[model samples]
Target: SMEQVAMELRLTELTRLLRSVLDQLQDKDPARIFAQPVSLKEVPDYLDHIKHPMDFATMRKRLEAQGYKNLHEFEEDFDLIIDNCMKYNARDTVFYRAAVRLRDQGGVVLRQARREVDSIG
Candidate 1:
């Protein structure tokens, strides 16, 4: 049933995309990321401007202007995937294919924040 399938697609997309965003945060930011917090206990709590499981319906386009990109999709013909899971239903199917170019398999990607210095350095 297309109706049920569509609903499942929405649900599946929600789960994967949110998890991808978290992974993206961990990857791109890589701990205490964009802004180094003031206190040792202020890791995730201090970054109130950004929140997990972002409201993609209204965020990524604007956020991309500020050095954010989606990792579930990426560059140089590469990408990250859950691989053959219902939750892996990304925009393209052939991105999953181990093709005639069998070695061209692309996967998840990331980057880390800069180290200005230790608090007392």
Candidate 2:
């Protein structure tokens, strides 16, 4: 059926868009601060402050596993990374400031991806 092919294209488009967003997020961070998971052992209070921790490495693994059902879920994890950074660090800290910047840029990236996907219709 035509519906079946459309569904396939939808998923293929979503996967490509998700990868593009993930790549952009990582590319924006030159310091690699968001490259890996925050070490709970190194920062004992981190888990206490961040109920849901996220990182680039974890997101990459999930993406490879095809864990995300759609672009929204992928974006949520992206936002979660920023949210965790902001929540764990003090307002004056670099991490918090970086998260704020990412929040702004991330929105732009997601919007672009949404527009690209919608154009298929």
Candidate 3:
């Protein structure tokens, strides 16, 4: 028991440092700092505001047609959000969870799985 306590000293110290620097990652990227429509960030907000069954089709297509958008699948757009967070060192679940809100459009189903980005190097 005494030896176990000795081993944890260094482990706990690094955790504190990890948390401190991780916050300001929000400052790194200007684009993803604010998720577009912003309703994409929350489940309740998405359903209450943006998730009308047939609502967003016009924008999704017209933007696609005009070349105003790149990622079409909701999963594709959602992963961009996740990748942005990992790149900038964010820890929020807002973007990750919204994958659920945006998954099924009309009657079509999206990705078979969800992804979370983390590393231990």
Candidate 4:
């Protein structure tokens, strides 16, 4: 019983940090392009380029269900959003540019979380 409480305490910090980062990205998504899955009908070749498709809507659902067991899991999903965007869109396109911007912005938030979490150690 006591161990379970300690485990929850450890997880709360990570969960909160993950939520904050997700919120930041969600708000920064221009045209809400990254808000949902890439439509196959719109981009017929989407699945052909990106093996692992991910989006904010999916991440929001996963986070709400406590699908992530650790910070790494959360980070993996976040990176997938960026990676998939860059892979599926041309470098000269706005989608690719947005992904690059998100990569930098998300990097700052993740690093901040890591530092704060480590300080609690």
Candidate 5:
């Protein structure tokens, strides 16, 4: 199943990246460290060989395929990911910040898709 595979891959990737980043910031202040500007360009390469998982089209397709046919559906999954990310690494502020950014980006993508769906309806 594509969804299952994708979900597993996403979890593994997120966990690995979160761990790596946390390790790097382990002895430092997570708030201050994350406050320093970090580029998306610098993220993908060092994070892993895998591409970022939360692209607009990919997220839209995944959500819709999973029967998330409405804005509420989109928001639900978005919140789920956010909750899991926070829960999985609760003690790590750096991971929390990263998860927030990822969720924010997904929200932007979902909003764009909602606009398109509305226009087509």
Candidate 6:
């Protein structure tokens, strides 16, 4: 439950961060011009370029180099991707936790779904 809760919290935080960033960009100075939001439909694939795990500093640099004025602009879209990964990570954590619990309970081997049989005379 903790793992699930953590993952959900991470996702919520990620979404909130993105919203904050977008709002900042929307409120950018009138003198400064900002790029339009490009659809980050394939964000996870795009993030793959980073050799290591997500690091805010590295991500900031990468985004800034691509013309994002600051972290806020970058985060608006980046958060969407982070949310996806968080869900995945959370699911895995849940499964692992379940396995451990089962082991602790001395349960038999976990098996695939069983087929249903109809009653016969």
| lDDT agreement with native, every candidate | 0.31, 0.82, 0.34, 0.82, 0.47, 0.37
Model 3 segments beyond 4 Å from truth? 29-81, 84-121
The residue pairs that clash in candidate 5, if any, are none
Each prediction's Cα RMSD? 19.6, 2.2, 17.5, 1.8, 14.6, 21.2
Tens-digit per-residue lDDT, 1-121, candidate 5: 9998977665554444333332333223334333232344766343353222332233444543444434465456445545654654465577777667665555555565557556643
Q: How close is candidate 3 to the true structure, as a TM-score?
A: 0.27
Model 4 steric clash pairs: none
Q: How far is 75's C-alpha from truth in model 1 (Å)?
A: 20
The full ranking of all candidates by TM-score, starting with the best, is 4, 2, 5, 3, 6, 1
**C-alpha TM-score for every candidate:** 0.23, 0.85, 0.27, 0.85, 0.39, 0.25
Give the Å shift of residue 111 in candidate 2. Answer: 0.8
Tell me the spans in candidate 6 whose CA falls farther than 4 Å from its real position.
29-121
Deviation (Å) of 97 in candidate 2: 0.9
Error of 6 at 91 (Å): 47
Q: Which regions of candidate 5 fall more than 4 Å away from where they truly are?
A: 1-66
How close to the true structure is residue 87 of candidate 4, measured as C-alpha lDDT? 76
Span of ten consecutive residues with least summed lDDT in model 6: 112-121
lDDT of 5: 0.47
Q: Judge candidate 4 at residue 23 and give its lDDT.
A: 90
State the weakest 10-residue window (summed lDDT) of model 1: 112-121
Q: Which stretches of candidate 1 lie over 4 Å from their true place?
A: 33-121
Candidate 4 Cα misplacement greater than 4 A, ranges: none
Model 6 lDDT on a 0 to 1 scale: 0.37
Residue 111 in model 5: lDDT: 62
**Tens-place lDDT digits, model 1, residues 25-113:** 43433222122212326434433532222222223343333223332332211221122211222445442232212222112223321
Per-residue lDDT tens digits for candidate 6, residues 1-121, read 9998976665555444434443443333222112222124845554454333333344444543444433344544444334433443444574334323433332121111001001110
